[PDB]
Each structure stands twice: as structure tokens, then as C-alpha cells.
Amino acid sequence: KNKCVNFNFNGLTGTGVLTESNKKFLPFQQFGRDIADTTDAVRDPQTL
């Protein structure tokens, strides 16, 4: 995190920088999108 680098996630592929948050994902969801239909929140596949 905290670095603009290239990422390849399950629902988003591109360049971004990860920051801390306080959201709580559901156990079946892997990524989240905003109102603008843009993926801005993902989940680590190993760490909760």
C-alpha cells in the first residue's frame, strides 16, 4: 500500500495506491465499487 503501482485484482486491472479504511466486507465478496460503478475497494485473499 501507499504507493502508485500497477495492480491486477479480480475485478480491477490498472494503476493505483492503496490506503487504510474502516469498511467491513461480506465473506463472499471480493471487491467493491462506488456509486460511479468504479472499483475503489478490494479485499486481501489471505489476510482478513
Binding site: 469498511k23 466486507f25 461480506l26 465478496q29 467493491g32
Partner: protein
């Protein structure tokens, strides 16, 4: 439901206290697993239990409901926690 060979299983568990009628409330069915079977499903059955102290068996006390889905437009209202709280049929 089956989407191009990928079988989806949704589930929801909640305590009730009734005899016949369903509650007039709302609940969101979350997915449980994902089974890539790659086959087509047209018919189905339901497992039931029987007891006897295959024609003289006796069942217990249970009930279930079977419905039919329709491809209509529905709205999804999410809260701050990301759960579906309301639904609007158009």
C-alpha cells in the same frame, strides 16, 4: 440457479415462530458456495426423511415452499454495512 455451467447456491437462515403463514418481512439471501458443474439442469427433487420402528415408513413434521422466478427488474437498497435492506419491484 445455473449460469453457463456455474451453479450458484444462495442461503439465508433466520429464526421464526409460526405454523403455516410466512412472515411479512424482508431478508437477503447470501451466496454460500460456487460449483462449476458444467452441466444443464432441467428437473430436480427434494430429500425427505422417514422413520420406522420401503412402504411402511413414517415421516416427521416439516414443510417447505417451492416458487418460480421471473426475469423482472428489481431495485437494491444498501445500507452503510453493505447489506440489502429494501427491494422494489418495477
Amino acid at each position: 440457479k445455473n449460469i453457463d455451467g456455474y451453479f450458484k447456491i444462495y442461503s439465508k437462515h433466520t429464526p421464526i415462530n409460526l405454523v403455516r403463514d410466512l412472515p411479512q418481512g424482508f431478508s437477503a439471501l447470501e451466496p454460500l458456495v460456487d460449483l462449476p458443474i458444467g452441466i444443464n439442469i432441467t428437473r430436480f427433487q427434494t430429500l425427505l426423511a422417514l422413520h420406522r420402528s420401503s412402504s411402511g415408513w413414517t415421516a416427521g413434521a416439516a414443510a417447505y415452499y417451492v416458487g418460480y422466478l421471473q426475469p423482472r427488474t428489481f431495485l437494491l437498497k444498501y445500507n452503510e454495512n453493505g447489506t440489502i435492506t429494501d427491494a422494489v419491484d418495477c
